[PDB]
Amino acid sequence: SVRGLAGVENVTELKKNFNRHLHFTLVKDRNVATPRDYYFALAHTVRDHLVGRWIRTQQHYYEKDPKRIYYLSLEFYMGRTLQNTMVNLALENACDEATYQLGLDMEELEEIEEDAGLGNGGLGRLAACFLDSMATLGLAAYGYGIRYEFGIFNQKICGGWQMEEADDWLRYGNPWEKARPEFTLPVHFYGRVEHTSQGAKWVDTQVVLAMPYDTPVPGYRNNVVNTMRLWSAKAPNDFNLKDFNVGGYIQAVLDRNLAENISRVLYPNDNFFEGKELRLKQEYFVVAATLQDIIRRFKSSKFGCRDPVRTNFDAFPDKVAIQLNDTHPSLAIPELMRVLVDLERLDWDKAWEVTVKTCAYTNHTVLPEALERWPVHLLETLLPRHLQIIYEINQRFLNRVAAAFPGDVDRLRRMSLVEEGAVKRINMAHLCIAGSHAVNGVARIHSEILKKTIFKDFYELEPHKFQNKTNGITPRRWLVLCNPGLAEIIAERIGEEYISDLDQLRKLLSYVDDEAFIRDVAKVKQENKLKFAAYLEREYKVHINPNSLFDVQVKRIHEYKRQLLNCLHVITLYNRIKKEPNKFVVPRTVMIGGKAAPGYHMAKMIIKLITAIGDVVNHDPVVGDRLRVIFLENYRVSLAEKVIPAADLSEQISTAGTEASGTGNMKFMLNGALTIGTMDGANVEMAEEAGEENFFIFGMRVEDVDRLDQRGYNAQEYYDRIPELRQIIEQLSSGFFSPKQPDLFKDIVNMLMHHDRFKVFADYEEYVKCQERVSALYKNPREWTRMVIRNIATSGKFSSDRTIAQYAREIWGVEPSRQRLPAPDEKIP
Amino acid sequence: SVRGLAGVENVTELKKNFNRHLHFTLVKDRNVATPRDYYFALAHTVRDHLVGRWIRTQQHYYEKDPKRIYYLSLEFYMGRTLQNTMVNLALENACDEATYQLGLDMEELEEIEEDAGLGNGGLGRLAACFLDSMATLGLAAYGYGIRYEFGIFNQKICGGWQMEEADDWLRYGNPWEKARPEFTLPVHFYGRVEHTSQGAKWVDTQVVLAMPYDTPVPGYRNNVVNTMRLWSAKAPNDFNLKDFNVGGYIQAVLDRNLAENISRVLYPNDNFFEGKELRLKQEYFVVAATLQDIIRRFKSSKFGCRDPVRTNFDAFPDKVAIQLNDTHPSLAIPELMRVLVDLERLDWDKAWEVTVKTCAYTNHTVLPEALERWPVHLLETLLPRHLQIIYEINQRFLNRVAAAFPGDVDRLRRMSLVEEGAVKRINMAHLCIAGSHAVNGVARIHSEILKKTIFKDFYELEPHKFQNKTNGITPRRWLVLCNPGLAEIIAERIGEEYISDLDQLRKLLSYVDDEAFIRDVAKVKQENKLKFAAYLEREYKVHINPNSLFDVQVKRIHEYKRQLLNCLHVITLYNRIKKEPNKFVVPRTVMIGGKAAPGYHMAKMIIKLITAIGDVVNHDPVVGDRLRVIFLENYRVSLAEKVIPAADLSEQISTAGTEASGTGNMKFMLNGALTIGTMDGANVEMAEEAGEENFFIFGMRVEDVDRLDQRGYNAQEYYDRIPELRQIIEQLSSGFFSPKQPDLFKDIVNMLMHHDRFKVFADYEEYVKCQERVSALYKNPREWTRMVIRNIATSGKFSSDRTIAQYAREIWGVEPSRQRLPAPDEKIP
Numbered sequence A, B: 001s002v003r004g005l006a007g008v009e010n011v012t013e014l015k016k017n018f019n020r021h022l023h024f025t026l027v028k029d030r031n032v033a034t035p036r037d038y039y040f041a042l043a044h045t046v047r048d049h050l051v052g053r054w055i056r057t058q059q060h061y062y063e064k065d066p067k068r069i070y071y072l073s074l075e076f077y078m079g080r081t082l083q084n085t086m087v088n089l090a091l092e093n094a095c096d097e098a099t100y101q102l103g104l105d106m107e108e109l110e111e112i113e114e115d116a117g118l119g120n121g122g123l124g125r126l127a128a129c130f131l132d133s134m135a136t137l138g139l140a141a142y143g144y145g146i147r148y149e150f151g152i153f154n155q156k157i158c159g160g161w162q163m164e165e166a167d168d169w170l171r172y173g174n175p176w177e178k179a180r181p182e183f184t185l186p187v188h189f190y191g192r193v194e195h196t197s198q199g200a201k202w203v204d205t206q207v208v209l210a211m212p213y214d215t216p217v218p219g220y221r222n223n224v225v226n227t228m229r230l231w232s233a234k235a236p237n238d239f240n241l242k243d244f245n246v247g248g249y250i251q252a253v254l255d256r257n258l259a260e261n262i263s264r265v266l267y268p269n270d271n272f273f274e275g276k277e278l279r280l281k282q283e284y285f286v287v288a289a290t291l292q293d294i295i296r297r298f299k300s301s302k303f304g305c306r307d308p309v310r311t312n313f314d315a316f317p318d319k320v321a322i323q324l325n326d327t328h329p330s331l332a333i334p335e336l337m338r339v340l341v342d343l344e345r346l347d348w349d350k351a352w353e354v355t356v357k358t359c360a361y362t363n364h365t366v367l368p369e370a371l372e373r374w375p376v377h378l379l380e381t382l383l384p385r386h387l388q389i390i391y392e393i394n395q396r397f398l399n400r401v402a403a404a405f406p407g408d409v410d411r412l413r414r415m416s417l418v419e420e421g422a423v424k425r426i427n428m429a430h431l432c433i434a435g436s437h438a439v440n441g442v443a444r445i446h447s448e449i450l451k452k453t454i455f456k457d458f459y460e461l462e463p464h465k466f467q468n469k470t471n472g473i474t475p476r477r478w479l480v481l482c483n484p485g486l487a488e489i490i491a492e493r494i495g496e497e498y499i500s501d502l503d504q505l506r507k508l509l510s511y512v513d514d515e516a517f518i519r520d521v522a523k524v525k526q527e528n529k530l531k532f533a534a535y536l537e538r539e540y541k542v543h544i545n546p547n548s549l550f551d552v553q554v555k556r557i558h559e560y561k562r563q564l565l566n567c568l569h570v571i572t573l574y575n576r577i578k579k580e581p582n583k584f585v586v587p588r589t590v591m592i593g594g595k596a597a598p599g600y601h602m603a604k605m606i607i608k609l610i611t612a613i614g615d616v617v618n619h620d621p622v623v624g625d626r627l628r629v630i631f632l633e634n635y636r637v638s639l640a641e642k643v644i645p646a647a648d649l650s651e652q653i654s655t656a657g658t659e660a661s662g663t664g665n666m667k668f669m670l671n672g673a674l675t676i677g678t679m680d681g682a683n684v685e686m687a688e689e690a691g692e693e694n695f696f697i698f699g700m701r702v703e704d705v706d707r708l709d710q711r712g713y714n715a716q717e718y719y720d721r722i723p724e725l726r727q728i729i730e731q732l733s734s735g736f737f738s739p740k741q742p743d744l745f746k747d748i749v750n751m752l753m754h755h756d757r758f759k760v761f762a763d764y765e766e767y768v769k770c771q772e773r774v775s776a777l778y779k780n781p782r783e784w785t786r787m788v789i790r791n792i793a794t795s796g797k798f799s800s801d802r803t804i805a806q807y808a809r810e811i812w813g814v815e816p817s818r819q820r821l822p823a824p825d826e827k828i829p
């Protein structure tokens, strides 16, 4: 592997610095230093290399003064960072040789690091990939979010059930972030509005400090190092404590550690709306603080130095761009108006024009329960002024609507940011649209439905706002990092340029017929299957028969992702084996992983099923090798980089129209797995890219689901007209998979049979047939690898560099780049 | 000043490392680095020098295997640490030159650091001095306590009143400690005892993790660097959170941050007993954890390697020594029995013999309200086994007593560790005596009363246990650090050896008659008076007339310290000035500082008085320079190092028999101030050391207070027979010092007049006469300085090196040393 150069001098300098940090920084010594200390010695040694260009990149922005892109997200699924750092700087071969010469194994050291899991799944990982791409593309970008004490809970399966253990990821600290207490900002909550003729005053507010923590974000070999600033909550030592009146000091000391709860933990609602005051507080927390830093940097640039002297915010939109990732940081709309109108005293009209030219909203899912609609009373109480500003935004917006569509009264009702009813609520999505100059979907099909259904009204008023930005995945982490084997064989043929531009992967189409290459693609895949089997064994259990089809569905447990459909299929393979015990079937290992939301009972049950089924199957003598059913515990970014490169079959079975885009699919595609999925989200574009013949699409298309809704879904029909399906439902309701507790899956079955919003039965037959075809192709090794080479070669479009390049040129108003910024070397500023 | 050598090479290496930490460690650059970053760059640069010998000293102990001294204290008043570190290593002149060449002023940088205030006052500072001495004396000592998030509250005086603001001392972090999460230990609480024939099991306990934080403790120029390990509380991520049963995960995440409250804040009860379950938890917290580390290091020495193979604890007392600083860590007695009996399965008799040979208790005050007596129900609940073990200790102890004094039934009642009544309690002091082989007082007079009154019974049973260890103060911090001016002039005459052995100060008696030296002692004192006036001005207010007697009483506000007596005296000087407005009196500035316990109403009032009086006095035209009354805000270790060296008069007015020892007195003595005090605590030994003629002793002696108690104290008598005293009481009750609120001091007066447990009036006359004599001597500059040279020269006995040397030889069983251990230089272990 060409993971960089193992320079003689660099290697010697590295080992020196490694021993220095071990001594001074860790205060350890080789005769007492554990793999962990060794891991930290390296981490710090590598960190040093980041700081140089980190300082230089940020300074670069002050001088040149390019437009700034602020990516506001309440999630940043970072995963480990040492290998990525090592790769993006060209330090992997130097560090390997260096630690080797020390007698340490870099692989074991990397396994010491823990996931910086400040995210649930797709939303956060997208942000993480985006961050990496914006840096690789030389964009003056800043990732802003919350610094959760504990990211997403660690998953433990005890007795087939999920257990929520806390993610104490900061236990041994994090050698990547840099606390910046000197830059702690004040956030205000509650209060009231003193209204005068000369202005509005948000007053009598409870203060919460926002302590920033900066993490360096290195671009691939271009010497660009951006910043991700995460806010940590801290109580102000003054209002609290000093108030001897009842506070009693000691109690107040303890109560101090109560406002700090804002950045305590990530809400485990993997895209789901819970109107919790804490969440709202978390959102406002990061919006206000972030927006202060934004205005600050705008004021200290060419304006607050010269230009029109009196800070004229006209050029604010040309210098600032804030991207609202979902509706979570939507408060940025009224907050920017608050600051500009109340503090900066700009007229309303001026502010709004400026606000809309700065903000852009990204819609991630059309599913209604994930939409944020806060009860008016909540906002009225926690943020009075913002609510007053939202009401004013709304009145002017609707005033425009009414003028565009005169008399269309229901339209007004439909386009009101304010929803009436038993509890008046505020539609955050509507806010973002009225307050952004661009709104985008995360996939071709997704963005169309947005203009056709949900935002059809908004689209009719402002067709110019709506766009599409089909999601990306980063080739550094998602290929070079997780699959150094595949990256090597590809590199031996086309060189390493692909890493910075995946579209070059198409050149591999010239090797579809090439014995060597075909054997290589097959060899790496098996190597990877071996490494994962080794990992599953050493870390958990079972010698998963590597000589089998690694069928894998890893993603958050949701009724629309359809793990249940896979469960049905699994039971099917088992039952067929029992009917014809001597009929050869392709040996298979079905791996499903993901975490269920804590209060999501059904999801909990589903997890329980995937394991319950395994108990039977995995122990039937008759099967004894042929079929394995396994649940992958605590599915996270690091496990993703593990399982995926060892994947044969990429399960992407969402009900058509549900999965807005998906990202796991693209990873599987990049890594040499064949996809079995519906015509949903990005699956559609993936199959178009590789040709529907190199894919395994099946089931109802969006139009079919709708026609079925039109007349109503009646699962009983499928149960009556499908005898093999009928058999499984009976094995469930009887207790075949729950002997000790026969009534166990009664609610799963009841839902399936009577309340399936995702039409599982309506896709069972076409699904089992599709799996038959896959097994069939697998029976032809050479043919499977040939279709694989056809998948990898057309993954180019699914790089976040392409996505980001689109956001930059189409929404942000910035031209990405790929020129290597210089390194400091020795000079200190 | 000879604050070390400013080596050309060392200076260059320092500046290099300073810029390195600024860049890499702080990620700053000279064009954006504030004095704070500059302060941190230096702090880290200096920290590096500590680590080398730190590692080497600890390693030294493993090989040599000397007896270990564990100093358990729930307080360690550390103050700043950069200058001390710089001095103890011989780095002050190199660092000054280094930063100077950088253009930075070391003095401003040092002022950036904040007090590591993990202590209230005397108890903690003693521990801090002791730590420094044990290191200077080459003792294998380890300071163990709690790592409070917030030390003692910062004091703010708003409108003449105290305001409790929190001490967020860890805000910008602490570059001295080293978190050691890898060594986190488990502490158990609550539960029950499973009792079998084969043993006792403390079970069903709530767990709390103890994360250690190590701070290096450098000995003066001997290259010895010991360790102070402070425990931080952290919830275990398992029992908490995973329990989905009602825990709800999120709530449990928040509740996780509830057990961590154990090391949250230092209880502001500057030596006072509040039976709070949190405090008890704080005490047990540090006892268990510490004791685990102790047993661990004992097991990995010559025993758990070879020796009798099966860990034989017979030699435990020869290897381990734990010093109970006050009754706070008394739980170490039953806890050591628990571990040895329950876990190690030693017979009771064997364990007890071992326990008593290991532990030694230090009594700090005879005042009853400061004595720990926990309600039996509390211990029964929070620590069931320990309570059962205490009952067994008691029964055997009393069995010995009864056998020594047959029939003495009341004795048994008096010597019972168990106190009967409406609420049965456990006398912690009795525990410590029955469980320690040595008990000591903190001053000659204090230790005698212990054998004569309070522990007269225990003394009669075991006369051999009782000793005296008159407190010390450290000459490095308390002279060399705070008074580099005095240390210089002394050094110019007798060399720098005194720093390591203060007894050499007696040589200054040869200069009592020496014009040069007399002028120098006078010159430094004025320089210091100038520097403090400059500090008071730049940091707070008033150009305190440096041409005045700096009369200062700085210490915790308590009725027995008698700030009120000083208040009476102050009002007296003012009133006399009004009677005879043209009669010359020595110009004076009376400074009083200290913090009142939050719920201590009277103390709060007293503070209010000291300021109330100033309002009048400080603004009377007639006075206009002659008399200033000032309250020094937020009196802490750093202010102590400030005010003291600028002190003329050292107010030490405690009611005879109340101040067990005192330490502030010694500091004032070392720094060139004359003392006006009672024959209390160490005042007695100080006057004996310098000859009662070089002191200003006054008031009732212990015998007089008692004879007054015998017949009863009637303040009315003094009010009736002292017309000037009578006048002040009327100015109070009328509202002369509280015009707007005439009834303001009614409770102060009521106490004074009817419930003064400290006989203030009974010492007023003799007190004003003594102050007349002091003013008189002050009128003779040469004579004052001559008596001063007589005070400084006899301070030798009050060094903690002497105290510690006594603890070592008389209680610990270790011979202190003063040989310079080697430095690592370049080699890395």
Ligand SMILES: *Cc1c(COP(=O)(O)O)cnc(C)c1O
Residues within 6 Å of the ligand: A120, A121, A122, A125, A554, A555, A556, A635, A636, A637, A640, A661, A662, A663, A664, A665
């Ligand atoms: C990228 C990623 C996701 C995406 O999964 P989808 O449902 O397939 O799109 C979620 N979780 C993890 C840990 C990821 O790696």
Ligand SMILES: *Cc1c(COP(=O)(O)O)cnc(C)c1O
Residues within 6 Å of the ligand: B120, B121, B122, B125, B554, B555, B556, B635, B636, B637, B640, B661, B662, B663, B664, B665
């Ligand atoms: C040493 C010290 C003490 C001691 O004061 P006393 O009452 O005089 O013995 C208390 N507080 C501080 C900050 C100290 O420096």
Ligand SMILES: OC[C@@H]1[C@@H](O)[C@H](O)[C@@H](O)c2cn[nH][n+]21
Residues within 6 Å of the ligand: A122, A123, A124, A126, A271, A364, A365, A442, A471, A659, A660, A661, A662, A663, A681
């Ligand atoms: O856009 C990133 C991912 C997307 O790929 C998923 O399909 C969608 O359900 C979602 C919601 N939030 N973030 N996401």
Ligand SMILES: OC[C@@H]1[C@@H](O)[C@H](O)[C@@H](O)c2cn[nH][n+]21
Residues within 6 Å of the ligand: B122, B123, B124, B126, B271, B364, B365, B442, B471, B659, B660, B661, B662, B663, B681
């Ligand atoms: O022993 C140190 C000091 C001592 O000098 C004080 O006089 C005494 O009141 C006390 C209580 N706790 N610690 N102390």
